[PDB]
Amino acid sequence: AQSPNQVTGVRPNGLEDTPMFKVNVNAAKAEAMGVALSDINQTISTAFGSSYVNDFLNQGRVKKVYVQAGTPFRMLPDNINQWYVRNASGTMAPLSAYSSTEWTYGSPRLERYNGIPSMEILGEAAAGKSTGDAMKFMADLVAKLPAGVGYSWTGLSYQEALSSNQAPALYAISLVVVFLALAALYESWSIPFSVMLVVPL
Amino acid sequence: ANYFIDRPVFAWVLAIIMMLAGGLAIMNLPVAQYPQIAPPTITVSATYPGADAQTVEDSVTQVIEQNMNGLDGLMYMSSTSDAAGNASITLTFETGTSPDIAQVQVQNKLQLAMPSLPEAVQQQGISVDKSSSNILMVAAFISDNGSLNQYDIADYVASNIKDPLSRTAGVGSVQLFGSEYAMRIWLDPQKLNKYNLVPSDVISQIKVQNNQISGGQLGGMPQAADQQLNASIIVQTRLQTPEEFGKILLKVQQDGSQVLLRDVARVELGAEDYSTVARYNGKPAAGIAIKLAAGANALDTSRAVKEELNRLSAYFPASLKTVYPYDTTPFIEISIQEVFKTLVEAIILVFLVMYLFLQNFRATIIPTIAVPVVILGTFAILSAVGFTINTLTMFGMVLAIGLLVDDAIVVVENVERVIAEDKLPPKEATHKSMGQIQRALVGIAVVLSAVFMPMAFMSGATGEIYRQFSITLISSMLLSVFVAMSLTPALCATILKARFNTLFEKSTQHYTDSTRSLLRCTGRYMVVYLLICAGMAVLFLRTPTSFLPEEDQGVFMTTAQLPSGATMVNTTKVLQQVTDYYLTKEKDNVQSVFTFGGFGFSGQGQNNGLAFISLKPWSERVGEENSVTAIIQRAMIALSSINKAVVFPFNLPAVAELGTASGFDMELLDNGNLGHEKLTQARNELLSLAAQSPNQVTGVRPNGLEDTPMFKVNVNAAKAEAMGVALSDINQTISTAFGSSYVNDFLNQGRVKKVYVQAGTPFRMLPDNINQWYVRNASGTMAPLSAYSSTEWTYGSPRLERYNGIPSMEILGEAAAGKSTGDAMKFMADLVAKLPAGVGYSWTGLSYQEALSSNQAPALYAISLVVVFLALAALYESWSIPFSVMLVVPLGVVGALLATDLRGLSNDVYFQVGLLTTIGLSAKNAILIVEFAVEMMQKEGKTPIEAIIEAARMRLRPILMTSLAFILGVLPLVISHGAGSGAQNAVGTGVMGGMFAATVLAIYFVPVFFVVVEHL
Amino acid sequence: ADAQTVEDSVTQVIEQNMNGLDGLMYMSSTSDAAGNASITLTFETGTSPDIAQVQVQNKLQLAMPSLPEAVQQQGISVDKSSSNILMVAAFISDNGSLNQ
Amino acid sequence: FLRTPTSFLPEEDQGVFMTTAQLPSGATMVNTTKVLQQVTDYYLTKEKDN
């Protein structure tokens, strides 16, 4: 970002870390009162997640059936206080009794490249500069990073690097081929040498 | 054609293009020890933890078999059900079938059949695998002193080594010899009884508490207006430590004390599969086999794999070393080096023959640069037609070298002779000589192509090897003809300029006067010829038949088998004795011993063991006392006193496809409806009827285990139901206690591992242990399992086999001293017919190949002979002239047969191809002589006798030069007795004994044949 | 499921088996907080898409037993089509009778 | 030749292009819809000629 004359609009192609909610269920207290941990987990998962139950028919097409809590009852961390779990004797006990809530942090999207963790980065080249110059500048910048991080070119950059690397060998092979063709066509080694001196012109 | 003589620059440009294309081909051409020889096979593997052989066969094997239909190119299918709970079905497909298509078809069929299988085998997952067995490296990892056991090494190599590999350029498949980690929970019947618990409760609590719960989202959609919060919810995560598993709450007592898993069981990070003990030189170890890819370079792949292992060695925990048993790179490198050395020595010998006969350095120059151009062009053609660089193709190149030498020698000698006489300038002499031998060269090319085609047009495993050899020879031949017709004339026109002599002149005069004395009573020699012909027949009836000579691969294999019902303690002791012997009595030769106890060749079991012995390099073992065959023949004597094992050493086959070229593989299908006992009765009637006649079959033996004692538990369902105990609970507690119980998966350091529940060791070792387990009533009271159950001892099969959906026995055997394989297969056939009514037989594996393609080579060679005769008739423009050429190649084959008999070798593939090359060269010489005679009859107005004598006189020198060059070019092959000496010795013997007899017989026998055929 | 749960179980289990392919150039993978694993294997030019898909689905069933339930129930999609949109066709309502 | 810049393929005017809007982490769709409506109303008003 502090070198706008070579690369512009460098941005990450990913999502940044976000706060996440954690619920800790006291299995010991739940078993002491009589409610089951499976019931608590299923209640939470169905209330705040979803539950694909069955298929039904609509206008002659098979569609899915989903069970979820209402919109007002899954918007806030305090809404967990509103849910109840049935005991083994039939009495209902609040879910807020045998539970504790807290906040942590976590990444909403994890990316991997060739089997190792990675972060995709996009960006354009500045006015006047080319894609190759931007690629070289990016490689130089990555070289100035903490030890242990590397860089890989992917997508269009892969093909660009391959073409730029493989062009001169193609030039040399084409020159050799045309030289040999001239030597074969005109039975002399003087004509090819007198002709191949014009290529630089 | 002849217009290249006027344009040397065109010929030089063509040579440069050929050399550049050859260099490009060598730069990127796959290399390997052998190509794909075996027909594609697909292996289906299923695991039933704790099941028996009969249970596996009834549940998994039969169900998978019944759905194995609709597969294209299927040849046969064989299934095995073990006593460890393993079902393995191998389906063999026809050669040429795409392995990926066959694999996907088998996988789809099994995928549709999956719901019919029990849940226990669905949980494990049935694996469908391609099979090529082109193992490149068997690199293993060892712990130095005692720190890391076999399971720690196996888990580390599974989680931090396999994934860095399997993605290296040229690596196709990585297979592991070991078991990863698992969460082993060892139950205690007394602790379970104290708390009134059963294994079902433990399994249920593990399933509910080692769970991943999808919490959902706070916020989410649909959401209310002005919502500003949206986060994920975490409820539960899968456990990841043994201590976490030990805190799993099972029940809460009325007192209030919490009952945990650790209160009733021992939780430990153990192994998934405990039934294998892998030791390297006596120390725990785990290994990996790398299987290479298609289109990859076996040299750079090996170098990159070694580099990656060296890089990862810095991350090893402690005292972890990487050894490399069975590396096949040295043999490929040796083959390439031998090919290059043979080429260089052949070039030097050609130079010596030229500056011994012709006495002109300019003459010696031309072949020296002609041969490498053709070799490089052959490499380019091999790359173009999609062929890899293996031992067979390189050996075909080795023979091709002499094939090229012959053409270069004849062309240059003819040009030099036409310069020597008639006082012609080099250009006009080149034009004349090329006019003389153009049609002869074209006819020679066509004849040799027709000769080499039958090897190309074969079928089976042998057909692929013959394809490699024939393609290499044909490409080299055609390119040599093109080069001798394009470049060599131009070089002769441009480069050439206008003691031994006395001896050669005297020899020519001797041949002339011998022919003058002969050609008057040819009839004598006529019948004499028949005598040699007769001898050839008997010779062809004496040489033994073998597929490929066994080579000094540097590794060999020893199998130890305990009698029956023997635990792994005795097998481990036996393997320890074996490795101690191999390491203290052969320390100079043997480098390492890799012993796998609990896994044999006849099936996995506790009474089996295998050992791979790796030897020192050939540079450290020299002579016959330090050879593989001698080493195993010394070890067999010492290991016969192993005290209650059937330990037996042997050498690895040259190719994993097959060995024992004399043995046979047959399966005795039961058919009908007779059971396992009535089939083993037939199998016992045989191996005895066959043993009563040892003049045809020697080693008739069964490839399978025999009946073993088994424990039977009879549960009184009525008594249990009367007492309130459910039969399901009784059947589940025993199964979970004695066999493993796979519960679910957990996360170890980010990798998914299994959780298993089983009883502790001291509680599942004796029949009395079943008296220690209790089951809960419906009222909550525990009662012993010994009340509703009784115990009994029966007999049962620890390994069942099926062939094509029918029970089989797979009685593999061997051939007699000399009886051929076909006679053995025709004896065991109708030996099965003497067996009781109901049974039948099938030939599988090797005997299958010699059951569908048998009368093929005679037809191919008859067609080849007809094509050769037609080509000769077209060349000579007559119907009787070709016979005088066709009746000479037996003289070529007779000497090769005699020499091979003298050396004591067998009818190897290398011998066959060398014999074909010698026949081709003899035919070429005869064709040239007869062409010169026919020309001197057409023009110059001469009788058939004087023409043939003068043609023989003219062509004596090139024949001698080519014979000397080829004979001395294969001389080092015979004298070689080191690494890669089998094929080398075979080709040396064949070529050296064929070429000399061919030339010696032909140079005298051509005129008499010519005059006899012309008279008739 | 969360992003970490998917990336640990599903993404990594499937990715651990995509090794022995024919002309694999490179493999990328994403795991989302909406419960989505998006492995993508880019092969060499000239490779047959049918053969590549066959190999990928052959190696996927070596990891399918290790995948958790509610992931096999929904289904594993193996697609050999292009990864870039060719054309988008939207549908609207003139007056506004039908909603989204 | 050593001073000329390298590239792969020149950029073209295909008649269509894209816009990506990314809100701070932890935001809801109530704000993303407003941001996307702002983008739409800018494109349809300040660039209605193209």
Residue numbers in the entry:
A (entry chain A): 705 to 905
B (entry chain C): 2 to 499, 513 to 1030
C (entry chain A): 52 to 151
D (entry chain A): 554 to 603
What does the published report state?
Here, we report cryo-electron microscopy structures of Escherichia coli multidrug transporter MdtF within native-lipid nanodiscs, including a single-point mutant with an altered multidrug phenotype and associated substrate-bound form. We reveal that drug binding domain and channel conformational plasticity likely governs promiscuous substrate specificity, analogous to its closely related, constitutively expressed counterpart, AcrB.
